Each structure stands twice: as structure tokens, then as C-alpha cells.
Design a protein around this ligand. Structure first.
Ligand code: GDP
Ligand code: MG
Length: 290
């Protein structure tokens, strides 16, 4: 069998130091990680494990790949994120009796596992103090053909409503702060729950609809870059025939290679930016898939 897990390179600005945790059961030094709970997405599990094992709150940034290791029951697969500490503090807990904050070179020597050193090597390979643009395809909204009335007003269905609710924890894991939605009800409804959680208004985006994008893709590219340049971590909820065009264009321009890809309803692209440059493009499956 295969056990899905998530973890992080937790880091702080002491000047970058990384957290290394000691687990006395095994007597080893590692990166924080743990298994996904039922219904949990990898990013939400990573943030929870950071809090349970280190005592810190954090904001996830760039994805740092996956590590597979054998366990008695079969295989454990762990997706890792860079995670900047935002608060909290370490007190000993069930799994961890010691935490040390080390510069990356010293942390590399402290780690027990070759695959944790590979993760830390990926961490240092690019900027970590990043901002994040979260591009979300709206949730499930039934069929255009079975809908009577303006297609623009077609609402989320029950499943899509559930996806919208499940996206709050996932987008908050990345420190979402500002909200944008293509001019379609189904796009606004996907981030409505997040708008209530943040108490933030959704800015309507006429240029990022399928129809607008098809007629004027250059206006849409320029609008994406403008949103990306504003302070904060914006969420942009749009449509299936818009997102691949925008993501592939930006990744080809920046020479960024996405490790995963897809375009499902409810999916999220985490775009990591440093000083205006794209440095990561991480596709997350819908919260009720995978
Ligand atoms: N190769 C490898 N083994 C690990 C790692 N973490 C834990 N283990 C080993 O895998 C087994 C299960 O540990 P773990 O995955 O932490 O699960 P838990 O301790 O039951 O929560 C134990 O033998 C661990 O020593 C790792 O990063 N790599
Ligand atoms: Mg283990």
C-alpha cells in the first residue's frame, strides 16, 4: 500500500535558517512531515504538521518535489513545500523533543536522510522569500447545454459548492490575501467562502473570461501581470479555456518547468514570484480528487 504524506522546509528570517526536528523514538533529525487525514489536501496537511511538530504557524510557498521511501505496509510518498514561519514557538511534543534553527549548510550536515538533503538542495536552488499568485479554476457547475438562461449566471452545483468550501483551507495555507474572479457567477461563487473567511471583496475581471481571453489574450496576459505586481498574494478564479494559455505562456517566458499539470475544475496553480520573476508553477488537484 501507498501512504500519502506532506511536509515542509520550515524557514525563518533570523537571513535564512531552517528548522530541523529531532524525534526521540527513532533518534534522528529530519524535516517536519506527516500523513494526510481523511479529506485533507497535501498543503493543509503540511501546514498542520508544521504546527503539530514545530509549534510554528507558517505560510507555504514553492513546492519542493516529492520523496518516496519504503515502509512495512509498502510505500510512503511525501510532497514538500517551502514554508516561512509567521509565528508560534517550539515546545516539546509527542513526536519532537528538540528543534534547531540552522543555516542551510549546517542543516544539510544535521539531516539523517539523503532524500531530506535532496529536498533542502531544491529549497536553496531558487529564492524562498516569494510571493504567490493562486490561479483557481472554478468548481463544478453542471452543463452549459442543460442550463436555461444566461450561461454567465450558471451557478456551482452541490459538488462545486463543496469544492469552494474546501478551497478556503487550501488557499489560506498559501497566505491568500486579495481576491479576483472572472465575470461569471460560477467563478465568484468558487471564492465566495474564502471572501467570507478573509472578509475581503472579490474584484470582477471582465478580461479573464473565456470569451474575452479568446478575443484578446494580450489584454488578459497584461492584466495577470498587473494583478501579480500588486502587494499581497492574489487569488484569481477563472475558466478552463483561459488557465492553460496563461500558465503555459508565463512558464515558457520564465523558463519554469511545472512538475505536475492538469486543468480540473477546482484545481489551483500556485505561482511563486521573486522580484517579479516566476520561480515556480505548482499544479494542485481539486480538493476532492487525488
Ligand atoms: N527512508 C526514510 N525512512 C523514514 C523517514 N521517516 C521515517 N522513516 C522510517 O519509516 C518508518 C515509519 O516512520 P514514519 O514514516 O515517520 O511514520 P510514523 O513514525 O509511524 O509516524 C520508520 O522506520 C522510520 O524510521 C524518511 O524520511 N526516510
Ligand atoms: Mg517516517
Amino acid at each position: 500500500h501507498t501512504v500519502r504524506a506532506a511536509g515542509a522546509v520550515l524557514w525563518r528570517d533570523a537571513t535564512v535558517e531552517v528548522a530541523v526536528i529531532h524525534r526521540p523514538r527513532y533518534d534522528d533529525w529530519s524535516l517536519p512531515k506527516g500523513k494526510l487525514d481523511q479529506g485533507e489536501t497535501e498543503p493543509v496537511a503540511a501546514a498542520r504538521e508544521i504546527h503539530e511538530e514545530t509549534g510554528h504557524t507558517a505560510v507555504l510557498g514553492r513546492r519542493l518535489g516529492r520523496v518516496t521511501y519504503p515502509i512495512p505496509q509498502g510505500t510512503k510518498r511525501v510532497w514538500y513545500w517551502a514554508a516561512k514561519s509567521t509565528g508560534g514557538d517550539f515546545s516539546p511534543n509527542d513526536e519532537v523533543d528538540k528543534l534547531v534553527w540552522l543555516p542551510v549548510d549546517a542543516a544539510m550536515d544535521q539531516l539523517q536522510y539523503p532524500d531530506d538533503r535532496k529536498v533542502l538542495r531544491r529549497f536553496v536552488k531558487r529564492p524562498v522569500d516569494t510571493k504567490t499568485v493562486l490561479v483557481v479554476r472554478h468548481g463544478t457547475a453542471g452543463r452549459r447545454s442543460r442550463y436555461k438562461g444566461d450561461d454567465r449566471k450558471r451557478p456551482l452545483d452541490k459538488r462545486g459548492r463543496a469544492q469552494a468550501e474546501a478551497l478556503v483551507a487550501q488557499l489560506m495555507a498559501f497566505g491568500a490575501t486579495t481576491l479576483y474572479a472572472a465575470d461569471r457567477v460560477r467563478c465568484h461563487q468558487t471564492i465566495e467562502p474564502l471572501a467570507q473567511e478573509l472578509d475581503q471583496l472579490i474584484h470582477n475581471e471582465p478580461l479573464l473570461t473565456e470569451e474575452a481571453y479568446a478575443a484578446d489574450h494580450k489584454a488578459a496576459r497584461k492584466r495577470l501581470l498587473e494583478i501579480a505586481g500588486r502587494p499581497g498574494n492574489p487569488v484569481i478564479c477563472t475558466q478552463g479555456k483561459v488557465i492553460p494559455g496563461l500558465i503555459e505562456w508565463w512558464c515558457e517566458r520564465a523558463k519554469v518547468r511545472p512538475e505536475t499539470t492538469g486543468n480540473r475544475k477546482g484545481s489551483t496553480w500556485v505561482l511563486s514570484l521573486s522580484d517579479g520573476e516566476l520561480v515556480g508553477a505548482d499544479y494542485l488537484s481539486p480538493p476532492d480528487e487525488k
